[PDB]
Each structure stands twice: as structure tokens, then as C-alpha cells.
Amino acid sequence: LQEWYREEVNEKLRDTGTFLTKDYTLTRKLIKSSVVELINHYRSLAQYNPKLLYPDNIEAVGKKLHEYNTQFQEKSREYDRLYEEYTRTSQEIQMKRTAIEAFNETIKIFEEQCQTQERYSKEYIEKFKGNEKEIQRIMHNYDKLKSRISEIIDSRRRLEEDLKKQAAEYREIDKRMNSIKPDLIQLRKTRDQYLMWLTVRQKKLNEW
Amino acid sequence: SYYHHHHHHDYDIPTPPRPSSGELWGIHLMPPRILVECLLPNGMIVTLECLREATLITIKHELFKEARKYPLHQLLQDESSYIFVSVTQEAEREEFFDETRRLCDLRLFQPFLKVIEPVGNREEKILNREIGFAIGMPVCEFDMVKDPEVQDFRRNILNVCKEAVDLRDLNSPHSRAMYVYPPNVESSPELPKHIYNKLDKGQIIVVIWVIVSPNNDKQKYTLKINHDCVPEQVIAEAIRKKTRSMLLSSEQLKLCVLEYQGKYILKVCGCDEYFLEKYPLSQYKYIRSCIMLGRMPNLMLMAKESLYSQLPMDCFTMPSYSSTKSLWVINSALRIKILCATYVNVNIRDIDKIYVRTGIYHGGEPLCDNVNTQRVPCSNPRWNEWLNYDIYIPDLPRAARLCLSICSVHCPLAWGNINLFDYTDTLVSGKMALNLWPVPHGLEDLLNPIGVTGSNPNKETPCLELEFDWFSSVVKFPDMSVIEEHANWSVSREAGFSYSHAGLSNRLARDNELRENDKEQLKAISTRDPLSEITEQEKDFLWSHRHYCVTIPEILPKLLLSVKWNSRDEVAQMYCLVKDWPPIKPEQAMELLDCNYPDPMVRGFAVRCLEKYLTDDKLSQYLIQLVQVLKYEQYLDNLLVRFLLKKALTNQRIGHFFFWHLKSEMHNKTVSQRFGLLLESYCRACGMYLKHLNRQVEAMEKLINLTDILKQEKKDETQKVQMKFLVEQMRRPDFMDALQGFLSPLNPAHQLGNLRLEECRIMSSAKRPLWLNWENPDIMSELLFQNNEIIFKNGDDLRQDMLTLQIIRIMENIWQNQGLDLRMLPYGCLSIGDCVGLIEVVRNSHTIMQIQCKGGLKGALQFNSHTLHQWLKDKNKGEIYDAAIDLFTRSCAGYCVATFILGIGDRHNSNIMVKDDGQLFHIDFGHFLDHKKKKFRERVPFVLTQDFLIVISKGAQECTKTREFERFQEMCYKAYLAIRQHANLFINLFSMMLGSGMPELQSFDDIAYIRKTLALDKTEQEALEYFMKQMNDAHHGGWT
């Protein structure tokens, strides 16, 4: 009677109806005369209690344990590396978005300043008429003010494009995570089954 | 030949998260002189050239002498009618009221200033900036939040903040000093037996100190009083001995004592700890250390009015923000319309087809989990189905929530969870816009309920919008009253059931007389740990005998996981047992604030436990776990928050760590809002400590920016060059301001005075951690430590250390207060940022490697096993020597057990350290519950080399066989078991930490390692032998 017959019970229940002090226990959607008698029968557990579908080389099955483990742990680094990029990008992105809001608010203060001077200066343009001496130098100041706001909107634009280029690269990172993920699970699932076929030799396995 | 001439064609030799931008946008450290456009009321743009570190006083006072050479001068008031303002990097227009501030310290976005006169004439109130700084997001960012809950939190939480400031000025100023300087005291007055016997039948020798004039000289009145006498008594005996005389009768003394006695309080020399209430001196921690360390206390008589001098009045101000229809009426099953995700980033090449898995949950789930068909797969994915959930709508528990996830063909893409009732008790009905969260590293599992409830605030993410069945009216949850009736009805209804029943497991049939085998299968379950999953039989067993289970309060944690929350019948009765269940010990109650106990009645109860039992000492022990448990609370405003907030406002030493633990996680947008709001509230009410926290914050920020430059620009330079740069920068005044007058956040009792830059330096590690060294500016520096030094480390995630060093601290107090003395040195460590923290330096200790580099002789042949012993002998000589080994033997023994139980990363010559006095202790623990086995054990990470074995048995040969080692080997057994009896706590502590994104704690099976290594499934005699066996096989001989 030795296919279905706590911690590594749950590790073989992971991701799959499934089933498997001093007697026996039946576990996924725990349950406490004979053993093989009762499981073949239930293979709907409603009618017992109100609220069971899924049950040669030696040394080169263990080199395949080394090989699928070099694949897996290279493949895991691929995942582990990209997750960081994914987050850094996310982060960097948002800092930009804030900067844009800050740029924006910088501009609004300056646009108001180019407005602010005309009220107070074009009272002094008409009162007295200071002559071409006074107003050539109130003209100089205003010349800068605008050519500065040029520079700011240049600077903000130049950022907004980069947001997109980052944002573009952001999407591309998740794209490739989501293709790498599913293969990573099978590479992992088979490397558990490959080591299950080997196991006693517990202590020979760590090098592969 | 080597490689079979295989070319790797691809490979080309050409080819710490970050980055927190610093003083100006896009640059870390602003150029030493810089140009800044000052904008005036008259629309004129000067462009002052300014030194990096110049104040706004300096800039204004000059700007109003360089604007005189520009037009329209008489359109500007006297400067004093004006104040600067500009855009910050957080992006707010911040009016600059503190003109003592410096230009580097402003966190400008672009280099410019604008003049105005102050609107919002309550100037005082626009020091929300202080709170905004402390928190690192502005308070106005909360004023703009629409959501009622958030605003309803802000206003209603002030209930708590008020009641807290009430309790402070109750019996003032004493009560104020009490808040500020709470007594640091062990929770038990009983003095452990090995501590006692260092006393000659209950006596310490102490040393009171005094000052008369000017402040200059001091004087040592060395008493010898009873361990279990109080500060008052001790203050007297000191004053007796100061003022005995030949010009004074006995009775004349008695009067001159009384009048002097209570004008003084006991300080500790060197740090701002004070002994301010009725406690046996033993019980105050400082004393109990001094006993253990072979030290004579150095206290101090400080004049109550020279202390009440210092405490400022907190000055708490209120801010500017000053028919239903029962769920049980609703007759239908639950259904939910899905509709369409939009932003779904997947390859149409690699991946086949995609769907939206959904479920209803309560921690673990109350129906069959369902999906939709795999529609418009990959390109433009849109469903428009109605998922039908086979739970009736009256059968929803209060806590329940929909969990969902978009999956592929098959593994998950994105997830998001929603509370089925809002915070006002109201079933969710209408249309929702839910933005998803990415899947974590370790999470393969398809759906993710342990994750945070609510939408992602990141806009550019999978926005899966959906619809909720709407019943013509606002569908609320029943009152308590309404739930009591249905419980009593379901009780009376149960009494007249009939003899037999198809599944009479749920019901009794034994009635008021239960069998004696049964009453002791319950207490047999009662004892078992949290992680031992329970069989349905046993649940139904418990659930039937539920009313006897009130005999055994401690059983509750199990009992609750027995109830089916999909049967409101059952649930309603549970609400009434729990209503008035016997209160339990806090160690068992905290289990009931983990993810598996999401109900609010349950969680209320669990607070009622803490309110009653949990002490300001034992709270401060477990604060980390309680702050992490906030993340499993459904709504902002709740009982646990109101508790912790209040304790924090009652006790300024908790307050302190409560800030930093929240402030620590402010980068992590799963809690940025929640914790923000909470910190705001704390910051508004804690009064003057805010100003102390604002200096600590200010300091940590300067350090962050510093290391950031070092780790990016100044790598690929010699240490030598980096070290020039470091000192050159610490020289500057904005730094000297920022880094000198403040409190250590590792422990705010210690002050940090001027920085000696002699002893400040960049360690050799590649992360570039800083070794900083401050003057202790206490009056009695001498009697504690003239120089205080701690390590700042930008780059590493501290919080796995932070936990293990906590866990160790607990194992020590477990062991030691059970009488059995293994001295662990859980050095101080504090996470304050993304990968930013602080580590207490332990002076006069070395890594075993350093020991061997010292004792290594001349020409590099081979290092000796004895070197350690020989270096340790050179330190400790005499009766001293024997005692230095006892210490070593005792610490080695604890650190053997602790290391093994936790499975912390393998120990070797570079991460085990030894002190001059001969205590051994581990640093730099790595990943804890065996995180490196995800790559392909039940490990021994402390494998005792020859080196230790020799030193253990005073230098013998073939050391494994001495008596010296039989002692040691016994300590290990006595220590292994002592923990095992408290293994529930250790489960619950790890269990509460799953809320953090620590990759070593992803879900309960991670924690399950600790079961096998404590061997809880066995009986104790088996464990001992399993432990012996596991210890024998790493060492290769010794353990029978």
C-alpha cells in the first residue's frame, strides 16, 4: 500500500480538490475500519459532514538536479533583479511626477511675477515720463523675467518626455516578469519532482 | 582543453534601492556659492549670489540693500514687513517663517525666493510645518484628501489626543516630568536568585552625588542600603550623611532631614533617566545592570525645582479641522459584476489567455472560489460578467472582504482587495474603481488575501473597475441588540432538537453533563500552539462544547477559528460569548490581533486585555509587533489605534519609538496614508518632544544625503579621499548645527553633544557606513561614558536584525527571570528609513578574526586554535580569569540555543564577537528562519570550533570530555527547554510580523521552521534528544 500514500504536507499542497501524538490524516479546497478501504469510495464529502480529485540512472538524475537548479537560480536572479528595476523605475517615476507639479508651481509664481510688475511698472511708465532712462532698465528686468519662464517650460517639457521614456520602460519590465514567472514555476515544480524521485541519500544532495 | 574550446559569444567584459534627492532638485549637495532669483512685491527680479549656508536673515538683509540699486525701490516696505516663500521638492509653496534657517536646509526645488507679507495672520498655526517636517509629507496634503474616513479619522482621533493631555497636567508638574522621564523599571519586583546572591543577603552599595557652588565641585556619599528600599528612603540616608555634625543633636537631624528630604530627586549620572516613583531600587533597570556587571550605582541628588525648571508646557491646541436597512432583511445570494481592466502588461506571444479569479474572505475564505472565462485574452482584456457567490447576503460577517486577482495560463498578474462593508457599517453597493498591486517576490499563490485592503494609489497600474449589487437602499450591518436577540433565539431553538441528527457533531447530545474524556481533550487542544492546524472534527468538537470552553479562557484563539463565519447563526452567538469572556494574558491576546482574527469584536476584546494587563514596560517590549498589527485593521479609526496613540501620549519613551517605527515605514505606500495620519495626530499632541524629534529627523536627513553622495559619486576614490570629503563636510556649519545638539534615537536618554570629528570615520565596508562619535554633555559624563558613538548605515535593511535582536532580548529575560543566567548582548539597532538605520557600538569587543590577526605570529604559516584563549588570558588574570570563562561559557550557551532555534545565517570568524571581559555575542545575523533553503536541512549555524571548546574547558586537550563542558552542555539543555515552554509567544511574535514586507516572513509556513527546530509536535524528552542529535551531528561528537 506504500500514490497519495504538516509543513511539507502543505508544500506539496501548494498551487494545485487535492488530497493526501499516537492514527492517519487526510488534508485543500484536515480530516482525521481500513485505510485504502475509505479513500477509493470518496474519490463528494458533503454527506458525512455539511460543508479528493488529484492524488533509473541515480547519478544523472542528480546532475539534472544540478542543471535544473542552475537554470532555476539563474532564472530566480532574473526575477529578483527585474523586481528592483520595476520598483526603482516606479519610484524614480513618481519623483518626476512630483517635480512636474513643483515645476508647474514654480511657473505659476513666475507667470504671476511677469504679471505683478506690469501693474506696478506701467503706473510708473505714465506718471512723470523718468524718460527713456528709467524705462529702458525696467525693460531690461522684464526681458530676463520672460526669457527665464522660457527656460523653465523648456526644463519641464524636457522632464515630461523622460517620464514617458521611463514609463515606457516600466511597462516593458512587467511584460517580461509576467513571461518569466510561469516558466519559473514549472522549472521549480519539476526540480521538486526530480529530487522527490531520488528520495535516502539526503546528505549527498547539497553540492548539486 | 579546459572548456572544449566552446566560445560564449554573448559575454562582453564591458558590464541599496535609492535615491532620496537632497538639498536642491537633481543634486545632492548644493554648490558652496550659488545664484538665487529673489522676486519682490514690485515684480523685479534681482539675482543674489549666495553662500550655500547663508541664512534668510543674511539673504533678506542683503536683498533689501541690493534692491536699492534696482528700479521701483519706494514700492517696497521696510524688510521686516516681509517673509520669503518658494516651491519645495515635496512641491508645496512653503512660507519661510523661520528666517534663522539656512538655504541648503530648505529643500528647495529650484534656486529661488519670493517676497510677500504673511497672510493667514495666525502665524503660530502655520507651524504645522514642524509636523510636516517630522512626518516628511506636508499636513496640507491631508487637507486635500476627499475621502470622509480620512477626515473623520483626523477629527475624531483628537478625542484621544485631548484625553491624553488631560492625564499629563493632572498632578503637575510631577505628572509632566513623569510623562517626559518615565521610570525605567523591570515589570517584576522579585529579584532572580542568581542576582540576589551578589548582595550579601539583600544589600547594595550605592553612591549619591551632590553639587553646592558655583556648579563646580561634587561630593560622593557612598551608602549601603537595602536593595528593596525606594528613592525617597535613599534620598534621606544621603541627606542624613551630608548633614550629620558635632553641632547637631540626633533629634535636630530628624527635622533638618524632613524639610530637605523631598526637595530632591534621584538622577542617574550620565543620562536622563530619573527615579521618580515608589519602586524598589532593584526594579529600576540601571540598578539591576550595575548589580549584574559588578558595578556601584552612581545616582545624583537633583533639586526638583532645577528639573521642573527644564520641562516646558506642552500647550496642546485644537486644529482648524475643528434611515438605514438591516443586512438581515436582504434576501439574495451575493453577486458582483466584473467589467474591465485596462493597463495589462503581458506578452501575447509567450502567454496564452487571462482571467479574473475572485473570492470572498475573512482571513481564510467562506465559499467556493470562482473565476470568469478567459476572455479577450491578452489584447484589450474586457469581461462583463456577473460572478455569483453561493453565500446568502445575511450570512456575511462584519469583517468580510472580496479578494481578487488577474491570472494567466497559469500564474497571477495583479491583485486588489476591497472591504465588503465600509467603515460606517454599510454593505458596498454601486460601481468601484480598483487599481491593482503587483505580485510579491515569493507569492506564487494565485489570489493574496493577507495583502492590504484598498486600492493602490499609483494611477498607472491595472485599474480593474467593477459593480456591486444594489438593493434600492443603504444596506447596513445589524446593531448589537439585533445580534443578541438572534443569538438567544438560536440558543433556545437549539434546546429542542431531537435525539439524533445528521452531523450531531456541531450540537452536543451530552447536554449539561459532558464526558470526562471530552473535558480533557479540550485542555489537550488548549495547550497546543497556534500553527498546529486543527481538524474539522476538533473544530466541531470545540464549537459544540463552546460553553464549557469559558472554563478555559486560553482556549479562545482556537475556538474562534472553529466558528464558521459563513453562518451568521453561529457568528451571532460567538459575539455574545466573546462579549463577556474571561480576560486573558497579553501573550495569548496578541495572537488575536494577527491576520487570522479579523473580526472587530474579537479585536476589541484583545485590546480590552491589553488595556487591563499589558504594562508600559511590556508594551515597549512588543511595540514593533503592535505597530505592525495596525496593518491588519480594516479601518483607520479603531480600538487598537486609540490605545497605542494614547499610551504614546502618556509615556514619552514609548512615544519616541512609536514615532520612529511609523516614520520608518513612511516610504511604503501601503501605509503612507494610514501612518501619516497617525503620526500627525501624535505630533500635534506630544507637545515639545516634536521639537526634539525635529532635530533627530534633521540629523538623520543630513546623514542620509551624506552617505548617498559617498555611495554614488565618491565610490572609485580611495577611502583616503572619501575621508577627506567626509570631514570637510562635517566641518561646514549647516552640519555642525544639524548634527550636534540632539538625542540618540537608539535611546533618547543619551544626549549627543558636539561631534568629535577626530573619532568620526567611514568604515571599511562597501555600503559606507559612518562611525559617528559625540561628546556626552551630561554633568556626570565621567561616571557613565565621556564619549557616545553609534553607527549610521545607509544601504542595508536593518529590520531583520531589529526583530532577531528583539527575539534574543526576550529569550534572555525568559531565561534569566526563571533563574538561569545566560548573558546575551542584544545590542541596540533601529530602522528609520528605506534601508537606513542605527547600530549601538559596543566598545572593547572584537571579531574572532581580529583576535587571530593579533595573535598570529610573524611568518604566515597557520593560525592557532588557542590564540583566542591566549588573548582572553592576557585580559583576565586571577579570580578574574575563572569568572571571564563563566561569562563566556554562559553567553556561548545562550547564543548556541538562540541561533539554532531561529536558524539565523551561518556564523563564522567574521560575525562572532568577543569582549575584553570575555562575553561572546553575535552580530550581523542575515536572513533568519532559514531563508537560504529556498535554494534546495534543520541547520546548526553556531558550530563550535576547537577555539571555543578550548576556552570553554580552561585550555585542556580533547576538551569535549571535561566537566567544564558537561556544565555547558547542561546549560544548553536547560535553555532549549525553557524557551520551548514559551514557544507560543515566539510563534505569535513572528505571526504578527507578516504585515511587513520582510521577504523572510512571507506566510505562516516560513514561521513553521521554528516548530521543527523547537520540535513541538513531539513530547519534551524527544525534543531534548532531537536537539542533542542535531547538536551532535554538526560538531561530530559530544552529545549523549
Ligand SMILES: O=c1[nH]cc(F)c(=O)[nH]1
Ligand atoms: O490597569 C491599568 N489601567 C490603567 C493604566 F493606565 C495602567 O497602566 N494599567
